[PDB]
Amino acid sequence: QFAFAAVRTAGEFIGLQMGLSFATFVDPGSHLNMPVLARIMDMLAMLLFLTFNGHLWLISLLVDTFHTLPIGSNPVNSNAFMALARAGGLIFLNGLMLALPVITLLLTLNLALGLLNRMAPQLSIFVIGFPLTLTVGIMLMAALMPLIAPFCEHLFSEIFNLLADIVS
Amino acid sequence: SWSLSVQTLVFITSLTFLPAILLMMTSFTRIIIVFGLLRNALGTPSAPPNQVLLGLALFLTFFIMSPVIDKIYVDAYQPFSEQKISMQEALDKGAQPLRAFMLRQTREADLALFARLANSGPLQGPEAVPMRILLPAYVTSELKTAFQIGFTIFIPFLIIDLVIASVLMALGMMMVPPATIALPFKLMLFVLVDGWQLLMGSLAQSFYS
Amino acid sequence: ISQFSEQVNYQRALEGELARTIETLGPVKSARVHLAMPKPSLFVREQKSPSASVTVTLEPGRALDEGQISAVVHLVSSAVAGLPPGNVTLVDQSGHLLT
Amino acid sequence: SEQVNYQRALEGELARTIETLGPVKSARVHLAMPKPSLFVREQKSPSASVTVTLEPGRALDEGQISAVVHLVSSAVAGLPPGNVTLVDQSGHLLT
Amino acid sequence: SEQVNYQRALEGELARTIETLGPVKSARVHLAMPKPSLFVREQKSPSASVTVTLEPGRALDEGQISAVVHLVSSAVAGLPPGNVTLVDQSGHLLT
Amino acid sequence: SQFSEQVNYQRALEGELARTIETLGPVKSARVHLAMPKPSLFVREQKSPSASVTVTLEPGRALDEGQISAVVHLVSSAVAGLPPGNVTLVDQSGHLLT
Amino acid sequence: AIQGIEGVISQLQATAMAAVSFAGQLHAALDRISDRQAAARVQAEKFTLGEPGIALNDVMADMQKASVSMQMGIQVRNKLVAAYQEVMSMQV
Amino acid sequence: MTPESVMMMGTEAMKVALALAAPLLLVALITGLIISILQAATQINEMTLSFIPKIVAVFIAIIVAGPWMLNLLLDYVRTLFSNLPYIIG
Amino acid sequence: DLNDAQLKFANDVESRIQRRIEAILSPIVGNGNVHAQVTAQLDFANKEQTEEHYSPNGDASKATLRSRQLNISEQVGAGPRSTQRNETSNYEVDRTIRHTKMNVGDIERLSVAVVVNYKTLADGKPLPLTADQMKQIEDLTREAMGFSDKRGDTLNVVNSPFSA
Amino acid sequence: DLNDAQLKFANDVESRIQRRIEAILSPIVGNGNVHAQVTAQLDFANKEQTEEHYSPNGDASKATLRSRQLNISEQVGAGPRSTQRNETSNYEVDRTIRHTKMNVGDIERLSVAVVVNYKTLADGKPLPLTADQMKQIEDLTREAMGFSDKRGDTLNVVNSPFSA
Amino acid sequence: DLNDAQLKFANDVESRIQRRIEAILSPIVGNGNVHAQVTAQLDFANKEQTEEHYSPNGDASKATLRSRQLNISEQVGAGPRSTQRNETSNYEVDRTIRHTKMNVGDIERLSVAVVVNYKTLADGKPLPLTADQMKQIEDLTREAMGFSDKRGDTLNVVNSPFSA
Amino acid sequence: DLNDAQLKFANDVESRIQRRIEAILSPIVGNGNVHAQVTAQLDFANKEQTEEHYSPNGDASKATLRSRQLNISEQVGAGPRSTQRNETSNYEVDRTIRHTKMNVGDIERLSVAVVVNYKTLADGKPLPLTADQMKQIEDLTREAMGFSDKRGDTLNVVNSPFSA
């Protein structure tokens, strides 16, 4: 599940830089939040996982962990648990990269808007910045959609070989 | 053949597993998963009440499994009822059309995986696959197909919410919830494009294709 | 750099260094190493063993010793995780199979 | 695209090494890398076609035919030599 | 689009190598690659049509026809040779 | 990326090992190649890492049996879980010293 | 089938290279119970027929044993169904 | 079924979303920019007078191009539901 | 389509048999002093066959057994004798499964017509050949054509002067 | 459509049989002194056949057995004799399944008409041929046409002077 | 397609047998004074066979046993004797499974035609060979061709003067 | 494809046997005064075999037992004697499983043809060899070819003067 968590994180951050849910910056956790991009890329990731037959692999590995770890009570290790907990870093680390391919340009766009506000005071931002940045984010990440699939396979491979290495 | 008491006992016992046959060997799973996903999509978790959707799914399954049931009746139930085929052979004769229907809709990858997990020998043709391999392969294929159908179903209902939120945000109304605005529009869409006829026909084709 | 790109680049780099060491060998004037690293699939049991093809150009008349062929085999096999020597092919500049 | 590009780059390098063989003036490698099917009785497997242009009269030795086969087979994950075809500039099958 | 483009690139390179073959002045390759299916039954084998223009009087040898067949078949994942048609500039089936 | 970090670490270890091997009297230049094992998306299995060491000797400076031994020990120790028997040592002429 | 015999020879080759179940047990138990009941019924019909050598004692005792075996099968079926219902009631 | 088909599915869907939302967003942006440059020219600065014409312009946008959006989205959904049983795996 | 391929296959087989006959008939009779033509009845029918054979076990010496129950009773009171023998035997038998797929394009029946010339001496008189030479030609043609009696092959070699 | 393809197939077969006959009939009779035409009754009917054969096991010597129960009782008191033999035998039998798909386009019945010319000597008199030569021509034509009696082939060779 | 490959395979086999015969027949008879041609009936039918053999255990000396129950009763009162023997035996038998896949392209029947020349001395008279030399040639050809009687091989070597 | 590889394998084996024969036949007969050719019938059929053998245990001395129940009763009243012996025995038997995969490419039957020259003395008369020398050549060729009788190997060595 960690991989889908990472994809959801990247999608939610792209959406938040869209300005889609501005009420979280003023009222954190105020029952008003819609990470619709996060849901879009979450279901796209689920479709990709279905395509790459990840669930069959999961079932096969569930079977295989017997040979490594038999039903009979066997002694257990420690830092191994940390590994799964340390996998919590991946959700953030991989999420940053997916965003990076778009947030950076969005950042530049916001920087550009700043240059416009360095001119005649007020009369900018909250009136011209939001629609422009929304449309730019939309078309940018619409073009960025073909990019997730190699990253999707990368995420699945990372989770799978981490599982294989640490379960043992 | 078995004594009449044994035959009656076996018949009564086998009458118990009807929900299991409906859920794990029939077209019911894909339809019910698609209906649940669609209900999750429109934003009304209690709209068509579970009983209405269950009845519609039962009627759809009855209309879809009609040729398989007909073949079972003509090949197994008719000779058994006319005392031409014993009780212990009618089951074997009737399990073959259902097996064929389950096979066509299954997937190679699942079949290969469950042929490997059983440590069985090579299966050069589909005629060597037993039921112990086809059952979970068919179940997994049905689950994956249902989830694929539901996840491509989900996309337009999230697209509408995305555009609604963006339009609301253009004008600075940042404190307006987008879901409350999007729900009537999602209902309007599902009304306009024959929401149910297209879905019904698509599911029925999805079986016969 | 994509995850796939990262791998392909790793493969290219390994090929380069291996060719480099092979060339440094006295009789060898230039080396070319091609690696075929395989793919795990949910429809097979033992993953296919990686394979390597090594082409050497020798110095005028510098024929490689049986031990020279052997040592080349060992080096290439070791440099590739799970490379079974028997899957290393060594060929000269004239197309003679040395392995 | 990433895969197709991998294919093109590999084909290129293989042709390159093949040309770097004394008797070979130019080489052309075509790879057919597909997806297999389990329990389909006789499935099939990856395949390669190699066309060589030789230097005037530079006939390839049986060993030369063998070494080309080995190299091409190794460079393709799970390429069974028997699925490598080697042909000359006149259309003679060398394999 | 990505697929169609891949198909037209493969066609181009194959024609290219075929023209390389001495007796061949120009080649034209048409591929028919069918819809894939991941079920447990649906499957169809692709097909190829190859038209060659020969140099004045440069008749292709039997072996030559054989090598063209091999190359085209290998370049297409799961192309059964028997589904490769080779024709000359006059409409003679060399197959 | 982590993978990039891992590749860099492998390269650095190779470099330092070659360095120490050269510093040795009879050795003019060294080249170390490490093959660290890999993870699988299924099935448990260790693949004891492997090393290939190529040495170029000074004109006529043949390595002692003890020298092969010491090279073996150093390379094996520098690689977590490297079984000596998986270290190959070769000269500039292609003679296997191990 | 011709292809079926091909598969048989293939499995024989598999055995060469290489060199019962709960449903089977239940089928065996049902067959045993039915065979006992049929044997008792056939002996009863033979006695009713008037054929010599068949004693009423044996007929009545065999009918008794068949009834006991039928009741055992009924109890096993009842429990087995109860256990299946219990397992299917588990919430996942 | 192939991941290329899936990612194409997402792209075309979200380009449809872009086409649906582009007229309204662009009209609002143009109105805001025009009102802002007029404010800069006249040296008038209140953050509320830019919000007034934006609503009217965006609401007119549905009057003029609304049928086109409604016809495009219905066609997209109809085609998606019709092609659903051919992209099954 | 396929029929033309089969016909070309038959033509090539016939031509090669003709050439093989001509090759041996040339050195002794002479170039052009021999002409032969071959026709071939071929087999283009796909046949698949599975054969099962059981070794007989009726003789107690070659019979292989797994379990055997032999109840013997003799209550002697011939008088009031009472013999009773209940024998039950379970056997294991030898088994041979052969699966055969016949080749498409095999030869069913080959008939060959060969004609030889006369012998024109230095004078020019067309002297006919002898019986021994004719028998030698017949034997050579039978060898070249792969003559067999199971197939039903027929061969006819006649001697006649060639026309101008 | 398909009928035209079948007809062209028949025409090619007939033409090739004609050419094969002419090839051997030319060297002895002479160019143009022989004309032959062939008609072929062909088989364009798709047939599929599955054959099952069981080896007889009525003789105890070739009978293969898996299980055999032989209860024998003899209560001698011929007097009050009482013999009783209950024999149950389970056999395993040889089995041969043959699956055959006949080729489309086979020849059913071939009839061939051949006409030869007379012999015009240096004077020019059209001298007819002899009985031995006619028999030789008949044998050669039978060999060339693949003459068989199971098919029902008919051959007719007549001698007559050709017209101008 | 495949038929042409099979035919080329047959041609190569025949040519190599021909060359092997010529190689030994050359040093003694002389270059060109010997000509041979080979035809090969080949096997292009895929066959798969599984063989099961059970060692007989009817003799008590070679019979292997796992469990044996022998109930013996003798109630002597021949008088009122009463003998009863109930014997049950479970055996373990030797078993041999052989799986064979015959090679495609094997030789079924080889027939070879060889012709030798006469001997022209310094005068030029074509003196025929002798019986001993002919027997030697026959033996050498039999050795070269791999002559066997199970296959059904036929060999014919005749002596005749070669034409100019 | 594979057939050509098998044929090349056979050619290499035959050539190496030929060279081995020539190597020993050269020093005594002389360079060029000996010619030999080898043909090899090879085995390209994949066979797999599993063999099971049970040691007989019918003799009480070599019989291994796990459990044995021997109930013996003798009620003497021969008079009214009553003997009863109920014996049950469970055995453990020796077992040997052998799994064999025969190599592909083995030699089935090797036949070799060897021809030697005559002896031309200083005068030049081609004096034939002697019986003892011929026997020595036969023995040497048998040793070189690996002659065996189980295979069915045939060897023929003849003496004849070589042609110019």
UniProtKB/Swiss-Prot annotation, chain B:
Subcellular localization, as worded in the UniProt entry:
Cell inner membrane; Bacterial flagellum basal body
> What is the membrane topology noted in the UniProt record heading this document?
Multi-pass membrane protein
Q: Which residue ranges traverse the bilayer?
A: 9-29, 52-72, 149-169, 173-193
Q: Which GO terms describe its cellular component?
A: bacterial-type flagellum basal body; plasma membrane
Biological-process GO terms, alphabetical = bacterial-type flagellum assembly; bacterial-type flagellum-dependent swarming motility; protein secretion
The disulfides recorded in the entry are none
Which key words tag this protein in UniProt? Bacterial flagellum, Bacterial flagellum biogenesis, Bacterial flagellum protein export, Cell inner membrane, Cell membrane, Membrane, Protein transport, Signal, Transmembrane, Transmembrane helix, Transport
- Top-rank taxon: Bacteria
Q: Principal place where this protein is found?
A: membrane
InterPro entries on file: FliP, T3SS_IM_P
Q: Family, per the entry?
A: Belongs to the FliP/MopC/SpaP family.
What job does the chain carry out? Plays a role in the flagellum-specific transport system.
Q: What protein name does the entry list?
A: Flagellar biosynthetic protein FliP
Which organism's genome codes for this protein? Answer: Salmonella typhimurium (strain LT2 / SGSC1412 / ATCC 700720)
Curated annotation (Swiss-Prot), chain G:
One biological process term in Gene Ontology? bacterial-type flagellum assembly
- Give the top-rank taxon of the lineage listed in the UniProt record for this protein: Bacteria
Task: List localization entries.
Answer: Bacterial flagellum basal body
Q: Does the keyword rRNA-binding apply?
A: no
Q: Which InterPro entries match?
A: FliE
* Record-level Gene Ontology MF annotations: cytoskeletal motor activity; structural molecule activity
Q: Where is the signal peptide?
A: none
Its keywords, alphabetically, are: Bacterial flagellum
Show the GO cellular component annotation of the record.
bacterial-type flagellum basal body
Its family? Belongs to the FliE family.
Q: Which PANTHER family match?
A: FLAGELLAR HOOK-BASAL BODY COMPLEX PROTEIN FLIE, PTHR34653
From the Swiss-Prot or TrEMBL record, give the protein name: Flagellar hook-basal body complex protein FliE
Protein species of origin:
Salmonella typhimurium (strain LT2 / SGSC1412 / ATCC 700720)
Its taxonomic placement starts with:
Bacteria, Pseudomonadati, Pseudomonadota, Gammaproteobacteria, Enterobacterales
Could you tell me the gene encoding this protein? fliE
UniProtKB/Swiss-Prot annotation, chain H:
Q: Which GO terms describe its cellular component?
A: bacterial-type flagellum basal body; plasma membrane
Q: Which cysteines are joined by disulfide bonds?
A: none
The way it spans or sits in the membrane comes to: Multi-pass membrane protein
Fetch the InterPro entries from UniProt.
Answer: Bac_export_3, FliQ
The Gene Ontology biological process terms listed for this entry are: bacterial-type flagellum assembly; protein secretion
Localisation = Cell inner membrane; Bacterial flagellum basal body
Keyword set includes Transmembrane helix: yes
* Keywords linked to the UniProt accession: Bacterial flagellum, Cell inner membrane, Cell membrane, Membrane, Transmembrane, Transmembrane helix
Q: Which residues cross the membrane?
A: 18-38, 55-75
The residues the entry assigns to the signal sequence are none
| NCBIfam families in UniProt | fliQ
Q: Which family does it belong to?
A: Belongs to the FliQ/MopD/SpaQ family.
Q: What's this protein's function?
A: Required for the assembly of the rivet at the earliest stage of flagellar biosynthesis.
Question: Would you tell me the protein name for this molecule?
Answer: Flagellar biosynthetic protein FliQ
From Swiss-Prot, chains I, J, K, L:
Highest taxon, organism lineage: Bacteria
Q: Where is the composition biased (Polar residues)?
A: 79-91
Q: Where does the protein end up?
A: Cell inner membrane; Bacterial flagellum basal body
Please report what switches on or represses expression of this protein.
Inhibited in nutrient-poor medium.
- Relate the assembly described in the record: The basal body constitutes a major portion of the flagellar organelle and consists of four rings (L,P,S, and M) mounted on a central rod. The M ring is integral to the inner membrane of the cell and may be connected to the flagellar rod via the S ring. The S (supramembrane ring) lies just distal to the M ring. The L and P rings lie in the outer membrane and the periplasmic space, respectively.
User: What is known about what this protein does?
Assistant: The M ring may be actively involved in energy transduction.
What family is this? Answer: Belongs to the FliF family.
The name under which this protein is listed is: Flagellar M-ring protein
**Gene name of the encoded protein:** fliF
Query: What residues of the intact protein does this structure contain?
Result: 229 to 439 of 560
